[PDB]
């Protein structure tokens, strides 16, 4: 088999050539050539067997995406592996060759406002179509934004997702770590678990942000600072806001802290849109019940230029739980993982 970086990366002899790019959840991501198709294409090698819950995101995320197929979502062209259980000890998925991901390009480039305005279009439109699946994505941070060489926009990464569940969000405070830090609504610190669609929103709003400015909005050095930030920039919540926490403790916590007043977000962001900085704000509320939705997103003026419902599809099969991959020990996940792979043989 081929060997990057010492490492077995066994896609041939279809898939030859072969570059490092970077790091997926399992593994390495590299480009290769498809002698099918001749044309460059992504890889990313996975290998969860050891780990319940390396399965289980595995599975996750080829569950789901088997089923989406939207412009603004990455899809699967392929997936390889072993032909028996026994002898499959990797996965690799083959996806798009994008150009780079939103993290490498904010790190050296800035961005016209035409570039924020359909960026923050495209990702929204691929939100739409998720969450009309009842699907929550809930890791949206600019490594998972990939671009390619037209700045046409598609989303990675859904080992993280879950079934939306609002009934059940309910937590207690600083117990739940959804997300990535610096994407993580405030909310998630105080008293959810992460199960509603405005997780993903606040995600989109802090993204947003950052591609106002090249720089993350709310930069926690660690899970406690992360609130800190938040609150340094939204000020102190409303008694209405603090009203709908009825946990004590993450209320009472909110109403140790002194006075906090807003910063502007034209003083954050002095060259941004007005526009641009109105749909900010409507997706970094911190109530997630005033929290705009993504279809209210895409409907703002900011947007105007490219909105269009009937061009921003919904998904035709919604997911309807969960499937239910707590308890099921790697066994038994390793079994499904092959047996979700299966199409793609031999
Ligand atoms: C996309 C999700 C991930 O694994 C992220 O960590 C991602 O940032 C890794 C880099 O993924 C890239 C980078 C590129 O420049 C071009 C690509 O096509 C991809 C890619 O398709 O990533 C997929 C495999 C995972």
Same mark, same amino acid.
């Given at each position: ?15 030859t ?20 198709? *001749? ?6 090698k996975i290998?969860?067997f ?8 595995? #599975? ?5 995406l ?5 412009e603004?979502?990455?899809? @699967?062209?392929?997936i ?25 390009? #904010? *790190?050296?480039?800035? #961005?016209?406002?035409?570039?924020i ?8 439109r691929?939100?739409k179509?998720i /969450?009309?699946?009842?699907?929550? /994505?809930?890791?949206? *941070?600019?490594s ?6 037209t ?15 609002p ?10 770590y ?14 959810? *678990?992460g ?9 989109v709003?802090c ?5 106002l400015?090249?720089?993350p909005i709310?930069?926690?050095?660690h ?9 340094? @920039?939204?000020?102190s919540?409303?008694?209405e ?8 403790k993450?209320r009472?916590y ?16 002095p ?7 109105? #749909? ?8 997630? /019940?005033?929290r @705009?939705?993504?279809?209210?997103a ?12 009937s061009?921003?599809?919904?998904a ?12 099921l ?11 979700e792979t299966?199409?793609?043989q031999?």
């Open positions: 088999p081929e060997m990057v970086r010492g490492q077995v990366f066994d896609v041939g002899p279809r898939y050539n072969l570059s490092y790019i970077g790091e997926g959840a399992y593994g390495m991501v590299c480009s290769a050539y498809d002698n099918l198709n *001749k044309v460059r294409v992504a890889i990313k290998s969860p050891e780990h319940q819950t390396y399965c289980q995101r595995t #599975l996750r995320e080829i569950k789901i088997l089923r989406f197929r939207h603004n979502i990455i899809g @699967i062209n392929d390889i592996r072993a032909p028996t259980i026994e002898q499959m000890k990797d996965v690799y998925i083959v996806q798009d060759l994008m150009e780079t991901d939103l993290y490498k390009l #904010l *790190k050296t480039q800035h #961005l016209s406002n035409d570039h305005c359909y960026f923050l279009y495209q990702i929204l691929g939100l179509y /969450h009309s699946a009842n699907v929550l /994505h809930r890791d949206l *941070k600019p998972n934004l990939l671009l390619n060489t700045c046409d926009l598609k989303i990675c990464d859904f080992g993280l997702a879950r079934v939306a569940d009934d059940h969000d309910h937590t207690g405070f600083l117990t739940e959804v997300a990535t830090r610096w994407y993580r609504a405030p909310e998630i610190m105080l008293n959810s *678990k199960y509603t669609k405005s997780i993903d929103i606040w995600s709003g993204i947003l942000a950052e591609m400015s090249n720089r709310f930069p926690g050095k899970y406690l600072d992360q609130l800190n930030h938040i609150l340094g @920039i939204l000020g919540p409303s008694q806001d603090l009203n709908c926490i009825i946990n004590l993450a009472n909110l109403l140790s802290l002194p006075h906090k007043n807003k910063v502007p977000w034209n003083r954050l962001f060259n941004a849109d007005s526009k641009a900085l109105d #749909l900010l704000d409507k997706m970094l509320t911190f109530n997630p /019940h005033k @705009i939705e993504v279809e209210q895409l409907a703002h003026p900011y947007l105007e230029q490219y909105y269009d419902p061009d921003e599809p919904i035709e099969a919604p997911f309807k739980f969960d499937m239910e991959l707590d308890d020990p790697k066994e038994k996940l390793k079994e499904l993982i092959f047996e299966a199409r793609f031999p």
